[PDB]
């Protein structure tokens, strides 16, 4: 055939891939974390948006830190061979490097490690997108007039 | 013959390192609102980094907090694209 380039990921596998949306709105009273009003608007917008991109969307609501880790582990052990990519959306409280389950925190590194090229071989070489709506600390940006 | 085990990840953060992220209780979060809008408008047109750059500009320019508390009033947000991708990403093909 003619000359070829490979500057772009192959996105014409039979499936675009999974879109896991973790929507944490209500937190265990003992954590002292407030409810995240408006997050259901986010979860619904994401579901529709990624549905139109032909992702297999799975919405999950109010997961404990244990459920988050087990979900990510189980998803990483699926056969992604026929899928172009992987998307995970996290909607929760957070701080730098951390996302909160309903009962306590989860290291972002623990979540993403399941999808390392050596630990999820059927996603190796494929784009793994983590979209994170969560605080990364407590600084506020005062902005500057244009 | 090998690729890095950390290759081919992209982290689309809502906010800069060390900062709060803003969520509106009626409209949803600034970042997710803007992300869905730009995916809706540009997923059949633009490479994903260029989509996320439009998201950055939308959040940075169109949003500013309103609070009865002076500490939290009139604040801004810039999202933070962290790419360890090795190729361009288009959601369309052919």
């Amino acid at each position: 055939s003619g000359i070829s380039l490979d500057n772009s990921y192959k996105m014409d596998y039979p499936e675009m891939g999974l879109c896991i949306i973790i929507n944490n709105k209500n937190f265990h009273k003992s954590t002292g974390m407030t409810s995240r009003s408006g997050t259901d608007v986010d979860a619904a917008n994401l579901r529709e948006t990624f549905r139109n991109l032909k992702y297999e969307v799975r919405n999950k609501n109010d997961l404990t830190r244990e459920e988050i880790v087990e979900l990510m582990r189980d998803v990483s052990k699926e056969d992604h061979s026929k899928r172009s990519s992987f998307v995970c959306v996290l909607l929760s409280h957070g701080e730098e490097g951390i996302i909160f389950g309903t009962n306590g925190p989860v290291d972002l590194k623990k979540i993403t490690n399941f999808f390392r090229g050596d630990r999820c071989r059927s996603l190796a070489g494929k784009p793994k997108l983590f979209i994170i709506q969560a605080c990364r600390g407590t600084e506020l940006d005062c902005g500057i007039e244009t | 013959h090998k690729i890095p085990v950390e290759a081919d990840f992209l982290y689309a953060y809502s906010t800069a390192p060390g900062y709060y992220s803003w969520r509106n209780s009626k409209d949803g979060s600034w970042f997710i609102q803007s992300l869905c809008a730009m995916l809706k408008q540009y997923a059949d047109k633009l490479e994903f980094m260029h989509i996320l750059t439009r998201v950055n500009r939308k959040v940075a320019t169109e949003f500013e907090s309103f609070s009865f508390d002076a500490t939290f009033h009139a604040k801004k947000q810039i999202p933070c694209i962290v790419s360890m991708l090795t190729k361009e990403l288009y959601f369309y093909h052919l």
Binding site: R36, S92, Q133 | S14, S21, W22, R23, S65, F66, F72
Partner: peptide
């Protein structure tokens, strides 16, 4: 407006 609220923070996360």
């Amino acid at each position: 407006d609220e923070v996360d």
